């Protein structure tokens, strides 16, 4: 819900408020395309996400190149979280059994018995990574965009 709130704010301000004042009038950053385009899901995909992400994906080689790296890294953490959300510890405890066997074979097995995370910790680890990746993705996209044009 808050992602839509901050997308609504970002597109509305650039389209209708923010801009450069000149002799003829006000020219906005996105040129008042909110009114006609934000009534379809395709409009948000094309005019907001695809068009405004141009700044972040062209940041390499400049002072804003850090936002490009975090934009990719955030995408990674988000997808990494789906591993914990879509699976269950039953698979992972059995996987560790085979891994522990290899360590036992080499007399390098730990004294603290490895255990797959609990059921609840899998859900907590999943949502924390899901939130961090998703929010950091918008964070990089907003700053690299607004700093570049705003």
């Amino acid at each position: 819900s808050l992602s839509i709130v901050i997308f609504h704010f970002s597109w509305k301000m650039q389209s209708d408020v923010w801009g450069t004042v000149t002799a003829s009038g006000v020219s906005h950053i996105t040129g008042g395309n909110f009114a006609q385009s934000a009534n379809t899901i395709n409009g948000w995909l094309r005019d907001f996400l695809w068009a405004q992400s141009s700044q972040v994906i062209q940041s390499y080689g400049s002072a804003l190149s850090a936002y490009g790296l975090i934009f990719l890294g955030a995408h990674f953490v988000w997808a990494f979280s789906l591993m914990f959300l879509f699976s269950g510890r039953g698979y992972w405890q059995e996987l560790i059994e085979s891994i522990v066997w290899a360590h036992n074979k080499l007399k390098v097995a730990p004294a603290i018995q490895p255990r797959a995370l609990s059921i609840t910790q899998g859900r907590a680890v999943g949502v924390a990574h899901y939130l961090l990746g998703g929010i950091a993705t918008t964070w990089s996209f907003f700053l690299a965009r607004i700093i570049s044009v705003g």
Binding site: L45, I57, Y60, S87, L95, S98, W101
Partner: protein, 733 residues
């Protein structure tokens, strides 16, 4: 109790909606039906296969009918280079006038869809030239569909049901399928190429009305019966031949030119004729190997019993395996899916690089769709191959009858197998991801010369052995003094070497550091997917966390929160997790194939060579750059012919995201929510007059995993299909 399902009394007695869902989902698991016997199991499967065959031939008939009725085949054959094929017509009452005009194209009467399946090039190559040719084929296959359907009915009747022993006659079935199903069919297909396809490619019509009075070769069967078989390879089609016409044509019907037809940029028909004649002889011969009622041949049980290494390295060897394979349908199905699944990948690999259909290469959208189509189907079949191998262990594996043989010994060192697959997956993931991230940081900081680019010397060395002289290895076929170069210099090397050293075709594309990284990512996908599937099979019968897992079956929800928690512990769940990695792996393969070809098709291969070494290039120069036309299919100013793919593109994202709901939120939340809905309905006046017959309940634990995986897969497929076609077709088509 309810009638449906008739095959399970447990389901029929269930008062909830689970009865409807589970009845559908257990329909084809014949082994689990009430009163099932082994003999009845085989007869049902035999009947079901007739139904599948009838659907296949009916589906093919529908394609032939619609192209002839609504396509532009007769116009396309005239100028295949500059005409888009038509799949079928559109009658959508929801269309507006701009949509009707947008989809009208190709000189059609009204709106139509453009074909991407390549049936035009295939049918044109095999000798079809007119709409009536397609009409007769459509009626013929509709008739063949009916016959198979009748046979399915016939062999269910009291006097025609085969016995159990009939289905277990291994030696006789292999002899027939190798010699007759494979050998004779390939021999017959050689007849079509010699009698129909090749003459049609030289401007001479041959049909059922005159094929008995037309000589395939000027010397009719005299070379064949006299042993002078070389006469059939004289005067082949010249390099100036214009396909479908008699100018520049030759007379040979069997050749080994080994290259591509210069005009159509596809394999010669005389080579494909000799190919099918060659394997037909091999397959017919190979079908005389096993024992039958005539006192000669091998018995497969004897072969397996013999092959035990004398040192005891493989224990008992292959003793007892004949009954293990001959008595288990899941073992046989696992071998069939594994073999067919690999061959499906081989089809995709060889068809894009050795295009067999005339004018297939220039149709970029068709080539992209065909490769993606079969690689995704191969991926699903491979996951099924391991699933049924896991089902075999639970249901059909008998430890006593496999004592000490190879199969039993696989379970003995399963931890070693899984541990080493785990190491390989970790090693590939760490270093493959690490090198990509390193190259990304270098690009971000503006130092492209500091990145780690490893030359694929081992793969470039293979290309040298095949004759690619770019790398300067001067090895085997790349050296003009090697015996390998000399011996083949009169049969197929002149054509093969000419094609492999042409850099405008997809025959052994040049590779560099960008290809090194992607290939190692593909290896990570194959090994990790195998790890998940192999663990699901070897641990299917039990584990330390659940020693008696076999007593619960292939698919069960869990063993509860005790012992730390056992979510996703069944072998069914290992397959469920492996499907995600299969989609991820095939996605990397199809992204790699598509991007490397788009740059080739535009002539700017340097873009892939430079931008493919870091992951920002993929996101920027492949996904973001090539979406521009797709997402403009409809916009506030209008729409064009791509608006269907633009709509389908978002349609895919929605089904994909809906799948997350079934995978993230689990049953307990929804069952308690439904209980207030049951309360609300009963207390609402004027609505509690109506009532349900099946008590509403939440989906089961296992069901939601399948439902979530189905949405995930469908959204996966539809999103990339729309992007693949739209990006390729709009760019060139």
């Amino acid at each position: 109790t309810k009638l449906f399902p008739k095959f399970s009394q447990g389901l029929a007695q269930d008062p909830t909606t689970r009865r409807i869902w589970y009845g559908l989902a257990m329909a084809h698991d014949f082994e689990s039906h009430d009163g099932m016997t082994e003999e009845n199991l085989y007869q049902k499967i035999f009947a079901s296969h007739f139904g599948q065959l009838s659907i296949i031939f009916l589906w093919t008939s529908g394609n032939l009918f619609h192209v002839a009725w609504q396509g532009n085949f007769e116009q396309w054959v005239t100028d295949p280079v500059h005409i888009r094929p038509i799949a079928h017509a559109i009658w959508d009452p929801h269309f507006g006038q701009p949509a009707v005009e947008a989809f009208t194209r190709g000189g059609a009467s009204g709106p139509v869809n453009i074909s991407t399946s390549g049936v035009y090039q295939w049918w044109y190559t095999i000798g079809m030239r007119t709409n009536q040719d397609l009409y007769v084929g459509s009626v013929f296959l509709a008739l063949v569909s009916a016959i198979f359907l009748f046979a399915g009915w016939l062999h269910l009747q009291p006097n025609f049901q085969p016995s159990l022993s009939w289905f277990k006659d291994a030696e006789s079935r292999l002899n027939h399928h190798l010699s007759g199903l494979f050998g004779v069919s390939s021999l017959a297909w050689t007849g079509h190429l010699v009698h129909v396809a090749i003459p049609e490619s030289r401007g001479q019509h041959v049909g059922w009305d005159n094929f008995l009075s037309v000589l395939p070769h000027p010397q009719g069967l005299t070379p064949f019966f006299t042993g002078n078989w070389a006469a059939y390879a004289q005067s082949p089609d010249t390099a100036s031949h214009v396909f479908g016409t008699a100018q520049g044509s030759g007379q040979a019907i069997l050749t080994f030119l080994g290259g591509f037809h210069p005009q159509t940029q596809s394999l010669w028909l005389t080579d494909m004729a000799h190919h099918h004649l060659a394997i037909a002889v091999i397959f017919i011969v190979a079908g005389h190997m096993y024992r039958t009622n005539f006192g000669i041949g091998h018995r497969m049980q004897a072969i397996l019993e013999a092959h035990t290494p004398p040192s005891g390295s493989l224990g008992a060897g292959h003793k007892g395996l004949f009954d293990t394979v001959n008595n288990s349908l899941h073992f046989q199905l696992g071998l069939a899916l594994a073999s067919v699944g690999t061959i499906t990948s081989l089809v995709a690999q060889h068809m894009y690089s050795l295009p067999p259909y005339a004018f297939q290469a220039i149709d970029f959208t068709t080539q992209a769709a065909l490769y993606t189509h079969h690689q995704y189907i191969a991926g699903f079949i491979m996951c099924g191959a391991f699933a049924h191998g896991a089902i075999f262990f639970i249901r059909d594996y008998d430890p006593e009858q496999n004592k000490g043989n190879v199969l039993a010994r696989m379970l003995d060192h399963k931890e070693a197998l899984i541990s080493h697959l785990s190491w390989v997956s970790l090693f590939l993931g760490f270093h493959t991801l690490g090198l990509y991230v390193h190259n990304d940081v270098m690009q971000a900081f503006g130092t492209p010369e500091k990145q780690i680019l490893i030359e694929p010397v081992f793969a470039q060395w293979i290309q040298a052995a095949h004759g690619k002289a770019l790398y300067g290895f001067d090895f085997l076929l790349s050296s003009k003094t090697s015996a390998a170069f000399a011996n083949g210099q009169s049969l197929w090397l002149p054509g093969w070497l000419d094609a492999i050293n042409n850099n405008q075709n997809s025959l052994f594309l040049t590779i560099g550091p960008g290809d090194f990284l992607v290939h190692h990512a593909i290896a990570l996908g194959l090994h990790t997917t195998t790890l998940i599937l192999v663990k699901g099979a070897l641990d299917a019968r039990g584990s330390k966390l659940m020693p008696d897992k076999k007593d619960f079956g292939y698919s069960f929800p869990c063993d509860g929160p005790g012992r730390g928690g056992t979510c996703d512990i069944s072998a069914y769940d290992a397959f469920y997790l492996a499907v995600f990695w299969m989609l991820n792996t095939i996605g990397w393969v199809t992204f790699y194939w598509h991007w490397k070809h788009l740059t080739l098709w535009q002539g700017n291969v340097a873009q892939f060579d430079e931008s493919s070494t870091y992951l920002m290039g993929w996101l920027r120069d492949y996904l973001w750059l090539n979406s521009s036309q797709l997402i403009n299919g409809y916009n506030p100013f209008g729409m064009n012919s791509l608006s269907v793919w633009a709509w389908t593109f978002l349609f895919g994202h929605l089904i994909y995201a809906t799948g997350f709901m079934f995978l993230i939120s689990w049953r307990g939340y929804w069952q308690e929510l439904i209980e207030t809905l049951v309360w609300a309905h009963e207390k609402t006046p004027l609505a509690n007059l109506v009532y349900w017959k099946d008590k509403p309940v939440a989906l089961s634990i296992v069901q939601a995993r399948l439902v979530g995986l189905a949405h995930f897969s469908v959204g996966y497929i539809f999103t990339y299909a729309a992007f693949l076609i739209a990006s390729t077709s709009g760019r060139f088509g």
